[PDB]
Amino acid sequence: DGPEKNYERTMAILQIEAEKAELRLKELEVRRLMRARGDGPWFHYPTIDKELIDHSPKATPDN
Amino acid sequence: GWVRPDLGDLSKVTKVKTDRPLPENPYHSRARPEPNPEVEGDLKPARHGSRLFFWTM
């Protein structure tokens, strides 16, 4: 291989690896925020579903 | 002039006309918490794949 091919092939390798490294660091930061704040799709622990609730008039009024 | 209601009459659900205003918040509920920011967009392939250590896919 001529030096130009290896040189520019090296750049393509560096671009891919650099982009992956940045994404790896961002994911660690996103995961840290979602776990602490609970406002993301990750670490979304279930809560009781409100469609299970019966809203019809009851045998007694105070409820 | 009183007529005894028939079998089944008094167990009917009837309708009442009342000038009383319908309550707004009979349960005295607080404002509900805001829903989590929804996610919208086009699903694209993962950038450079799994990105797991050395794997290229």
What is the DSSP-derived secondary structure letter of residue A3?
A: H
Name the method of structure determination. Answer: cryo-EM
Identity of residue A42: W
Interface test with A, best of B13, B40, B51, B55 (most A CBs within 10 A): B51
SS3 A7: helix
Contacts of A16 by beta carbon, 8 Å cutoff, 6+ apart: B48
What is the DSSP-derived secondary structure letter of residue A50?
A: G
Resolution of the entry in angstroms: 2.3
